[PDB]
Write a protein that binds this ligand. Structure first.
Ligand code: HEM
Ligand SMILES: O=Nc1ccccc1
Length: 151
């Protein structure tokens, strides 16, 4: 469980991400897709994108970045009490999208790498630590739904 102080650091930096949900989304997906090309293959929607320039120019990618960061923000603002928000995500991602839990680790690294670029002053190592912890709690809870479902 995160402390109240840890939550405040998390949600402080997230309030900032939300100045530009779309721009954050782009940076995060593109970092994921370049660092972990296997991830891009899970998306029939996006696997025609063969360069970073093409990814950056994709309005549909941008659109989907917002869908993702919107869901994550909702989850983070529950400060651990995210059961309702997490059940549908775990279901669709295990059984329909076929996403390994390992890939949640990779997007966690991407989120941290980007939150870093765009809000250094509000993402010192204390806030980085808190954000790590929050993303780890999320992954743990997803992992247990996965195990339930046989994935
Ligand atoms: C922070 C982690 C994540 C969040 C919050 C998230 C959120 C979402 C949401 C809200 C949707 C649409 C609704 C649904 O189908 O359930 C979605 C769809 C999807 N997600 Fe994720 N996701 C996450 C991680 C990942 C990762 C790491 C991958 C792949 C490596 C992935 C692959 C997909 C795919 C393939 C779809 C279907 C998209 C389409 O073609 O339209 N997700 N995600
Ligand atoms: O659509 N869900 C995604 C979440 C994170 C990265 C890429 C896609």
């Amino acid at each position: 469980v995160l402390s109240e102080g840890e939550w405040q650091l998390v949600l402080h930096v997230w309030a900032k991400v939300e100045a530009d949900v779309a721009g954050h989304g782009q940076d995060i997906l593109i970092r994921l897709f370049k660092s972990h090309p296997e991830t891009l293959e899970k998306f029939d929607r996006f696997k025609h994108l063969k360069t970073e320039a093409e990814m950056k120019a994709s309005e549909d990618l941008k659109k989907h970045g917002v869908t993702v960061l919107t869901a994550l923000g909702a989850i983070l603002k529950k400060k651990g009490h995210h059961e309702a928000e997490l059940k549908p995500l775990a279901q669709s991602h295990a059984t329909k999208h076929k996403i390994p839990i390992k890939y949640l680790e990779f997007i966690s690294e991407a989120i941290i790498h980007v939150l870093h670029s765009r809000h250094p002053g509000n993402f010192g190592a204390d806030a980085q630590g808190a954000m790590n912890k929050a993303l780890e709690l999320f992954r743990k809870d997803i992992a247990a739904k996965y195990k339930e479902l046989g994935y």
